[PDB]
Amino acid sequence: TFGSGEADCGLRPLFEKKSLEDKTERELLESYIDGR
Amino acid sequence: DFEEIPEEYLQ
Amino acid sequence: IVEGSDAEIGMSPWQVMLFRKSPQELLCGASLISDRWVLTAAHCLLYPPWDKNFTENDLLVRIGKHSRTRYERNIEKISMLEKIYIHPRYNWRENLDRDIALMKLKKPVAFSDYIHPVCLPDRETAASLLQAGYKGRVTGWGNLKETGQPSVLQVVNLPIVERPVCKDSTRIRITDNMFCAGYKPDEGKRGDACEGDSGGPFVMKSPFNNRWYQMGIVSWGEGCDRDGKYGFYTHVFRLKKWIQKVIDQFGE
Ligand SMILES: NC(=[NH2+])c1ccc2nc(C(O)(O)c3nc4ccc(C(N)=[NH2+])cc4[nH]3)[nH]c2c1
Ligand code: NA
Ligand SMILES: [Zn+2]
Ligand SMILES: [Zn+2]
Ligand SMILES: [Zn+2]
Prior knowledge:
Chain A has 1 helix and no strands. Chain A is mainly alpha-helical. Chain A has one domain (1-36): Thrombin light chain domain (Epsilon-Thrombin, Chain L), CATH 4.10.140.10. Chain A starts with 24 loop residues before the first helix and ends in a 5-residue tail after the last helix. In chain B, 0% of the residues lie in helices and 0% in strands. Chain A binds chain C through residues 1-6, 8-16, 22-25, 27-29, 31-32, 35-36, and chain C through 5, 8-11, 13, 33-34, 37, 111-114, 116-122, 125, 128-129, 131, 133-137, 155, 157, 159, 204-207, 210-213, 240, 243-244, 247-248, 252. The complex binds BIS(5-amidino-2-benzimidazolyl)methane ketone hydrate, sodium ion and zinc ion (ZN) (3 copies). BIS(5-amidino-2-benzimidazolyl)methane ketone hydrate binds at residues 27-28, 43-44, 192-195, 197-198, 218, 220-221, 224, 231 of chain C. It is classed as hydrolase/hydrolase inhibitor.
């Protein structure tokens, strides 16, 4: 809705919320010169 | 191509 | 989407579908930002050059989908609009500057594993993630080739391109409210949004708090996946104050 979203925004029930990744999110994080 | 949707969403 | 693959179930829970009542056809893509607001591209609604001027009553919003043509019973929710608000300075005459619009749904929608809103970025997220070389993701039920429609939602991840390059690829004047994305002819990769994917989201996953933020809206392009060309997206953050304003003026 506003800044940084809504509160519960951007965290997907089937992925983030269960600590599961989708098959290509790695690419994205890897392009920000790697993440973690 | 699209499938019919429940009449109630048109009204 | 061209050269993109099918999405996974609940991969883009915020992807929305603007649907025309009569004829019943896909109009554009859109995203869910709260339980009553949907964010899309203004030209999906108003574009005088082609006599397009949609009103509340002419659209439907379908959330929770995967399939393009089927009414996924018990999985998708169909809402009506209460109000459509187009940015007052949207420029359809020259370059689709401030191509952004907000729709308020009649009633709030409930989230599920298939419906969830996306986050709108804040100055610090926008500044750290909108760098050239960083990839974002676009999704939609649009054409697969310029000249060929998918059954399922498609996804493609594209690098953000340096503004000078975006500029040197078109004769249209680029403003600071747009950014372009795509692979260089030289990078050996393809992908792009295409007709039908407009209004949908370009999102990035913050490596800081693992949330997905919608950085752009699919705005325009010169064809779909031509080499040397790119796709332009509305800069959500640069227009966020406008968003905030209608939301805390007309609701939430
Ligand atoms: N029948 C419709 N509902 C419709 C709506 C908007 C359209 N806008 C165009 C376009 O033809 O103006 C158009 N929208 C684009 C969005 C992304 C890209 C891209 N990145 N290749 C190209 C685009 N071209 N045709 C359209 C058709
Ligand atoms: Na290109
Ligand atoms: Zn939740
Ligand atoms: Zn379009
Ligand atoms: Zn086109």
